[PDB]
Amino acid sequence: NKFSASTVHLEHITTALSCLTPFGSKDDVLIFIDADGLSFVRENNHVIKIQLLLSRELFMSYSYRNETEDHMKLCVKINHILDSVSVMNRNSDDIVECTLSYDGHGSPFVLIFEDSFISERVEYSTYLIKDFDTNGLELDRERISFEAIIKGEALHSALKDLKEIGCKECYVYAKTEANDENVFALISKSQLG
Amino acid sequence: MKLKLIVNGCEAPDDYKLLRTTINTVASLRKTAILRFNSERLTIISTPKSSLNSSNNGTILRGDTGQLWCTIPHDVFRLYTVISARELNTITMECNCDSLLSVFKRYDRVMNQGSSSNMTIKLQSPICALGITFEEIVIMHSFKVPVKLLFRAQDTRIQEPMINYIQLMMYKLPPISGEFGSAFHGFIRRVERYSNVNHIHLMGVKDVELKIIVNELDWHLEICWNGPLDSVISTHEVIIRCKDWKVCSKLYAAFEEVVLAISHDESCVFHCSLDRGERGQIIYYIARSKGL
């Protein structure tokens, strides 16, 4: 096969999938395969794009024997994968060793779940890739107006508060005072005010 | 037509399970049953080709073509007396499985209540009744289940299907009590977590590899088995239904010597046996539901 990746920490590829569902629950997901790692890219309404990356270091074996092209693009449906890997995950406590595979354009995306007794094999049909390119929705790296590094828990709590107050629209304030003060706020328009 | 027998569960704990497996699987299969009380072997038969009162709309609106042909030796029961003017004293009957199964549940529960009382089965005189009687340990339980006396000419029409062996490849399924038994049972019932699967494409490739392929979903699923499998004795495949696989799952769960017989695009035969020591073989003949 032109690409083969084997792992046992399936919780990593499960949380990676659980990070993709927010960007639509039934549509096409683009998978980019190169030597560095495996990346999933999803775009919604040409206004937002998400790009997770699973490095080769997350897999014991990462062959990528493809030589004619440096990178391989495939488009598959996310509802097939989510509906599949749900019933597979019924007995996830078992020592499962996921094996991703792709043999090139026209071949399906294979996802083998072997438990040393049962080897479930799921082949996902690959679809044609749409016209929109994911490199359009990227920031220009020479025009940054603000660069904030924030913790994960605080941002998650702020987002959960914005969700609980409704927050139809949102604002981001970023001011650095001269003395030592840095101001970062997430102002919201909602039912409250 | 003198038919009398007595069964005592405690003395032999294997023949009772052998009989219970037939009385349960026939009831699950279809309504009513045939009991061929030959002079030496009891042959409980569940067939849509006959059964007289089980041949209404079997292979007509549901595709029920499954034929189970079990065999109970005479040594299972305590007294095996068969008197009939037919050849080898053959007494073929046809009664419902509902009352018989309920009676067997009652007897099994009476056993579970701490009793050693036996059960007496008689034929109290072409429609008759079965005089099932037993007690607690002196409460009386009498069940006169209706039964019939299906004719010898009708008996002759009930012949076991003749399975060829030109392309048949047997597969020795592992014993449930073994280490791989639980894993194989889980692999067998794994196809049951998808409620939208009606047909199962069995596959065996010769150390043989047993493979289950499902092609009724948006994705192509292949349920494989990498464990050890023995072939008592080219890929032979057959498409069967899901209920015909559930009953095979139950039969494998209830037996140890289980053989999976696969005819290429013709049939699938589930041969179960119980070597008590002659042997209480349970045979289910399943026909292809689609073409390969």
Swiss-Prot record, chain B:
InterPro entries xref list: Hus1/Mec3
Any one GO molecular function term: DNA binding
Keywords of the record: Cell cycle, DNA damage, DNA repair, DNA-binding, Nucleus, Phosphoprotein
Quaternary structure, from the entry: Component of the checkpoint clamp complex composed of DDC1, MEC3 and RAD17. The interaction with MEC3 is performed in a RAD17-dependent manner. The checkpoint clamp complex loads onto DNA. Interacts with the DNA polymerase zeta subunit REV7. Also forms a heterotrimer with 2 RAD17 subunits. Interacts with SET1.
Stated name of the protein: DNA damage checkpoint control protein MEC3
Additional detail: Present with 414 molecules/cell in log phase SD medium.
GO CC, one annotated term: nucleus
Name of one Pfam family that matches: Hus1
PANTHER family, A to Z: CHECKPOINT PROTEIN, MITOTIC AND DNA DAMAGE CHECKPOINT PROTEIN HUS1
Family affiliation: Belongs to the MEC3 family.
Location of the protein in the cell: Nucleus
A single GO BP: double-strand break repair via homologous recombination
Superkingdom of the organism of origin: Eukaryota
